[PDB]
Amino acid sequence: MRKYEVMYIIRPNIDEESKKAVIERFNNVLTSNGAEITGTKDWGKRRLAYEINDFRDGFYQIVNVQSDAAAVQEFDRLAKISDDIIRHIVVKEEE
Amino acid sequence: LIEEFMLVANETVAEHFHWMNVPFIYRIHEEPNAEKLQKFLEFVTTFGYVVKGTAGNIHPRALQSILDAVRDRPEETVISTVMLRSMKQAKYDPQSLGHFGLSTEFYTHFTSPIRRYPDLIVHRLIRTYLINGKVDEATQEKWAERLPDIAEHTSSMERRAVDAERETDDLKKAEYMLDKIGEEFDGMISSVTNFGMFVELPNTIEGLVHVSFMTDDYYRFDEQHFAMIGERTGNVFRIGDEITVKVVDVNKDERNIDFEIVGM
Amino acid sequence: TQERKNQLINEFKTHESDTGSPEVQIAILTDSINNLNEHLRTHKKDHHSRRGLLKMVGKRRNLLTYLRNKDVTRYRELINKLGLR
Amino acid sequence: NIESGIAHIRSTFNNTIVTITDTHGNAISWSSAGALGFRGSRKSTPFAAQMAAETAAKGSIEHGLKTLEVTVKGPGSGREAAIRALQAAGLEVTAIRDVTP
Amino acid sequence: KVCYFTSNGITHIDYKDVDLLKKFVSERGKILPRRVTGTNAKYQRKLTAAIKRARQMALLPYVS
RNA sequence: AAAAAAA
RNA sequence: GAACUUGAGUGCAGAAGAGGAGAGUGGAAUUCCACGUGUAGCGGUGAAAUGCGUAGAGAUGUGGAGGAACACCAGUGGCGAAGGCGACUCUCUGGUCUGUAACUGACGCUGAGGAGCGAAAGCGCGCCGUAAACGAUGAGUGCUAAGUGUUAGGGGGUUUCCGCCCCUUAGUGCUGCAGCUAACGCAUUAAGCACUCCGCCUGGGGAGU
C-alpha cells in the first residue's frame, strides 16, 4: 500500500462534541477498509478564501494514511454524501 | 544608525518647545496633494496594489503598506517614484503642523547648524529660552515677527540648493555618457509619455527613448495604464518593464541622453 | 509490481545472477502483456496503451524466435511453463 | 437594516452603473451616470462614475450599510474613481473583484 | 533574481504551507510569472500545482 | 521630472 | 562450431512530462426559463436617432439551458508515432532520458502487402478514411570547425549549501564553418560525407477525368 494525505474541512456550525464524532467516523471508515492512520493534525477553524456552501470558515482536518485505493476511494465516496464534510481532497504523498 | 539618532534628537527638541509654547521654527511636511494622490492611487491599482483609504485622509502607514508589498519587485522603483510625485515637499515654518513623511506631530532640524540656517536659529532659541531663561513677552514678540520671513526664505534657499545640485549631477551623468555612444545596457522603464519613454540604468542614469526611434510600430500612449502600445504588433512597453537599450546621442549642454530599443 | 517481478526473475533465471536470459525477459514481458491485456478489457478505447502493447508483444516474439534458433530445448521448456504457442 | 453588502459596478464605455446589494444579491439601492442626468461623452467619464457611486452609496447608508465588497464589470474608465467614491462616502471596502464575463 | 527553492534547498513544495505560496501569487491572487519571481522552471511547475491544489481547497483565493 | 533624511 | 561485447535488451539506481483511458470535484463564466430585490431608462455611438421602457427594464440573486472549456501559471517549455494533449484530485496504463554495468550475447535494422491509429471530415455513435495528415525535407547507423540559449540529467571543483566554474548525456533553438546547392539555402536536429531498406518522380494540359 501507498501513503496518502487526506485533508478535509468540516462545516463551521458544529460543537466540539459533534466534530469529534465526524473525526471518529471518517478515521473509522479508513481503518475499517484496511487503512492505518499515521498522523492526524487539526488546523482548527480557518477563514475560507471563498464561500463554500454559504460558510466563510471551516474546520480543517489533515489525515496522513497508508492504504489501498479501496480505503481512499471509500472515504472519497462517503466524504461527498456527508453534509458535515463540505470540501476534501485525497492526495498521494512523496512515495 | 546615525539617521535614527539625529531623528529622535530632532523629535525630542521640537516636542520640548511645542509644550513650552514659545515662538520656534519647525520642519513641517504637509499632507500630499489630494488630486495628485488620487492619480497615484489609480496607477497602483493597475499593478494590483489595492490600498485602504481615500486621497483626502490618507494615513502615512497606508503608503508604507504599498512600499513593503512592492519590495524586490520590478515595479518598485517606479511606484516608489510615482508615489513621490504625489508627495508635497517639506518646508520650515513657525507653526507646529507635523511631519507627514516621518508620521510625527513634532519635528525640527537641530542637528546641522554648520550647514543649515534653520538649525543655527534653533541653537539661538535654545540659548534664548532654556539657558538664558528669556521667556519675556518682548523676546517672544521679536522672534514671532522674524520667524515667518526666515522660514519662507530658508525654505526657498533649500529648494534652490537641491535644484542646483541635481542640475550639476544631471550635467555630469551626461558628461559620463559621451564616450558610451553605441554601447548596449540593461535598464528599466522609469517613465512613459506621449512623446516616448524614459529608461533608468543600474547606475541611475536616465535616458529617453523618443517614439521616432520606435521604428517597428505606430505607438499610442495610454494615459491610464502608463504604457506605449503598438497598433499593429500589439507590443506593450510599460512603466516597470526591464529592457535593453543602446546609446544613440548625448548632448552635454542640453543634458539629454537619447536611447534606442534593441530588445525587451 | 517489483516484488512480483522479483518472483518471476527467481523462477525463470538460468543461474544465480541472471536477469538477461530471454526466459527471464520473456517471463517478464509475458506478465506485463497479461497485465496490459487485462487493462484493455476495461479500457477498450485506450489507444495509446495498446500501441505500447503491440511493442511488448513484438519484443517478446523476437526474443522467442531468437531462443528458438539458439537452443530448441530451452525454447520448448519455456513455452510450456508460461503457456505460449 | 443590513450592514454588509456588495457594490456591483458596471462600467461600460457608454455608462457606469452602480447597484448596491445585500450578500444574497437583493438590491438595496442603485444609481447611474444617466440617472444623474449626464449625457453622451460625460456618462463614460470617471467623474460620472464617481458621482454615480456616491448617489448609490448615500442611498445605501440610509438602509444602514457600513462594509462593501465590490464587484466590477466592463472595460470602462469608472471603476477606480467609483471605488474611491465608495470609500469616500464612508463605507469600508473589504475586497474588490473583477467579474468581467 | 534567485530561486527561493534552489536557494533554501527546498525539494518539496507543500500546498498546505499557505504563507510560502502567498509569496508567489499577486495581491489579486493570480500566479506570478517565473521571470518576475526568479523561480526555476522545475519549481515553477511544482509551485503551479501546489497553488492550484491550495485554491481548490480554498486555502488561497481564485480571485481576491 | 518631482520624497524624506543625510552630507 | 565456438568465443567476445562495443549493437540491442533485461536488472538495479535516479528524473521530467498538457502521453493515454476511466471516476469525481473545483471556481469562474455564458445566457435560457421561473422566481426575489430592484427603479426608470438603459442601450444604441458623431450622438442620438434605430431602438427600446416604470406591465420596472439596464442592473442584482436562487433554482436554470447543462451544454461547452479551464482565466493567471504559459516558455519555438514539456509530452506523443501522427492527429495531438493545458483546472485540480483519484484509479489504471504507455513511452522517454540520465547513471551503474548485474545479466543476456547480435537477440539488429528497414519493411511491399496486411493490421491498427488517424481532420472540418461526409453521412447515418457508427460509418467515412482521406486531409500542407508538408520544418514541402522516409527510417536506421557512423563520420565531419565553432560559438551561444533553453528543458531533464550525470560527474568534478571549491562549495556550509546555495554559489558560480567545467566536462558529459538526451532533447529543443539561434548563428556559423568544411562540404553541398541552379540559386535560395542547409550546415553534428545536413539538404555534408558513407552504407542498408522502403515510398515516390520522369514536359504541360487532357485528368484525378
Curated annotation (Swiss-Prot), chain A:
Keyword tags: Ribonucleoprotein, Ribosomal protein, RNA-binding, rRNA-binding
PROSITE patterns tied to this protein: RIBOSOMAL_S6
Highest taxon listed in the record's lineage: Bacteria
One term of GO molecular function: small ribosomal subunit rRNA binding
An annotated GO BP: translation
Cellular component terms per the entry's GO annotation: cytoplasm; ribonucleoprotein complex; ribosome
SUPFAM superfamilies found in the cross-reference section: Ribosomal protein S6 (SSF54995)
InterPro entries linked: Ribosomal_bS6, Ribosomal_bS6_CS, Ribosomal_bS6_sf, Ribosomal_S6_plastid/chlpt, Transl_elong_EF1B/ribsomal_bS6
Keyword rRNA-binding among UniProt keywords: yes
Induction: Strongly expressed during exponential growth, decreases 2-4-fold in stationary phase, part of the rpsF-ssbA-rpsR operon. The operon is induced by DNA damage by mitomycin C.
Subunit-structure text: Part of the 30S ribosomal subunit.
Family per record: Belongs to the bacterial ribosomal protein bS6 family.
Summary of the function given for this chain in its UniProt record: Binds together with bS18 to 16S ribosomal RNA.
Name of this chain's protein: Small ribosomal subunit protein bS6
Organism of this sequence: Bacillus subtilis (strain 168)
Swiss-Prot record, chain B:
Recorded phenotype for the gene knockout or disruption: No visible phenotype. Increased half-life of type I toxin-antitoxin system RNAs of BsrG/SR4.
Domain S1 motif: 182-262
Induction info: Constitutively expressed, part of a 5 gene operon with multiple promoters. Not ethanol-stress induced.
Compartment(s): Cytoplasm
Family to which the UniProt record says this protein belongs: Belongs to the RNR ribonuclease family. RNase R subfamily.
Function description: 3'-5' exoribonuclease that releases 5'-nucleoside monophosphates and is involved in maturation of structured RNAs. Involved in degradation of type I toxin-antitoxin system bsrG/SR4 RNAs.
Protein name: Ribonuclease R
Organism: Bacillus subtilis (strain 168)
Swiss-Prot record, chain C:
InterPro entries: Ribosomal_uS15, Ribosomal_uS15_bac-type, uS15_NS1_RNA-bd_sf
Cytoplasm as UniProt keyword: no
SMART domains found in the cross-reference section: Ribosomal_S15 (SM01387)
Plastid among keywords: no
Biased composition (Basic and acidic residues): 1-18
GO terms, molecular function: rRNA binding; structural constituent of ribosome
Pfam families: Ribosomal_S15
GO cellular component: cytosolic small ribosomal subunit
Example GO BP: translation
UniProt entry keywords in alphabetical sequence: Ribonucleoprotein, Ribosomal protein, RNA-binding, rRNA-binding
Quaternary structure (record): Part of the 30S ribosomal subunit. Forms a bridge to the 50S subunit in the 70S ribosome, contacting the 23S rRNA.
Role summary: One of the primary rRNA binding proteins, it binds directly to 16S rRNA where it helps nucleate assembly of the platform of the 30S subunit by binding and bridging several RNA helices of the 16S rRNA.
Family: Belongs to the universal ribosomal protein uS15 family.
Protein name: Small ribosomal subunit protein uS15
Swiss-Prot record, chain D:
GO cellular component: a single term: cytosolic small ribosomal subunit
UniProt keyword terms in alphabetical order: Ribonucleoprotein, Ribosomal protein, RNA-binding, rRNA-binding
GO biological process: translation
GO molecular function, one term: rRNA binding
Keyword Nucleus tagged: no
Domain of life: Bacteria
Signal peptide: none
Family as reported in the entry's similarity comment: Belongs to the universal ribosomal protein uS11 family.
Role: Located on the platform of the 30S subunit, it bridges several disparate RNA helices of the 16S rRNA. Forms part of the Shine-Dalgarno cleft in the 70S ribosome.
Subunit-level organization: Part of the 30S ribosomal subunit. Interacts with proteins S7 and S18. Binds to IF-3. Interacts with VmlR. Interacts with BrxC.
Stated name of the protein: Small ribosomal subunit protein uS11
Encoding gene per record: rpsK
Section covered of the full-length record: 17 to 117 of 131
